[PDB]
């Protein structure tokens, strides 16, 4: 019984870490890329007016 419950725990721990992995995808790709593209503009009205 202990081994079965431990296997279930390991499966659910891997599941939770996959969830954390998707959270990391959110943090970097969703936001860090969003921030990089938003600031990469530097409001092109800058270079245009240059």
């Amino acid at each position: 019984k202990n081994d079965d419950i431990n296997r279930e725990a390991h499966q659910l721990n891997e599941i939770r870490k996959k969830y954390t992995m998707r959270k990391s995808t959110i943090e970097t790709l969703r936001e860090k890329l969003d921030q990089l593209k938003r600031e990469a503009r530097k409001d092109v009205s800058q270079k245009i007016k240059d």
Partner: protein
Amino acid sequence: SRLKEIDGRLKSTKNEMRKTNFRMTELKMNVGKVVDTGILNSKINERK
């Protein structure tokens, strides 16, 4: 006197058996510590 010595050895052996069994079971319980194989894969994929 020899009987008392052997009985003391017997009790010490029983205590050692109990300690070893409990340590074995603690080693079993150490498998349950949260091992994580998550977030790193996302960054691996992004970097690749």
